[PDB]
């Protein structure tokens, strides 16, 4: 679990979105595993606007933050799950690191701010859904 709070927006994994997220829907993209809903309270997270390939992520299954090198956002094949059939997920970045399904939503940050959230994993790899291209989150 986990979300990014920026301005009047809440960013979450689309597969973990609540009834409230869907009733206050702004945008969602199944191919990116993202959903953005509106909030009544103002968010203070800073979104990074960069091409950083190093950062730190929070791993709830270990109660620890880990430093990682990660790939550039791209289309990566993702195994079928209870939420999606087998498919390419876009805007995904992989790193060598620990993750379990409940780790989705953990923030990945660089010196510039929030880069994305945990979205996939398996076999000692962790995947992050990028949010740096969503320029509208700031306005
Ligand atoms: C952090 O996720 C994991 C980590 C480890 C393992 C293990 N065994 C499995 C996962 N789950 C995972 O990758 N999923 C399930 C939820 C939807 C995700 C998606 N974006 O399509 C794909
Ligand atoms: Zn950066």
UniProtKB/Swiss-Prot annotation:
Binding-site list for Zn(2+) 1: 50, 52, 110, 112
Residues the record marks as active site: 15 (for protease 2a activity), 33 (for protease 2a activity), 104 (for protease 2a activity)
Catalyses which reaction(s): Selective cleavage of Tyr-|-Gly bond in the picornavirus polyprotein
Summary of subunit composition and partner proteins: Homodimer.
Task performed by this protein: Cysteine protease that cleaves viral polyprotein and specific host proteins. It is responsible for the autocatalytic cleavage between the P1 and P2 regions, which is the first cleavage occurring in the polyprotein. Also cleaves the host translation initiation factor EIF4G1, in order to shut down the capped cellular mRNA translation. Inhibits the host nucleus-cytoplasm protein and RNA trafficking by cleaving host members of the nuclear pores. Counteracts stress granule formation probably by antagonizing its assembly or promoting its dissassembly.
The name this protein goes by in its record: Protease 2A
Species assigned in the record: Coxsackievirus A16 (strain G-10)
Lineage, highest ranks first: Viruses, Riboviria, Orthornavirae, Pisuviricota, Pisoniviricetes
């Amino acid at each position: 679990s986990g979300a990014i709070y920026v301005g009047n927006y809440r960013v979450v994994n689309r597969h973990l979105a609540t009834h409230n997220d869907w009733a206050n829907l702004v945008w969602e993209d199944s191919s990116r595993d993202l959903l953005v809903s509106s909030t009544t309270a103002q968010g203070c997270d800073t979104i990074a606007r960069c091409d950083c390939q190093t950062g730190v992520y929070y791993c709830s299954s270990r109660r620890k933050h880990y430093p990682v090198s990660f790939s550039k956002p791209s289309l990566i094949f993702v195994e079928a799950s209870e939420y999606y059939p087998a498919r390419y997920q876009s805007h995904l970045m992989l790193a060598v690191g620990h993750s379990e399904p409940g780790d989705c939503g953990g923030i990945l940050r660089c010196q510039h701010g929030v880069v994305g959230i945990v979205s996939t994993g398996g076999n000692g790899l962790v995947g992050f859904a990028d949010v740096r291209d969503l320029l509208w989150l700031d306005e």
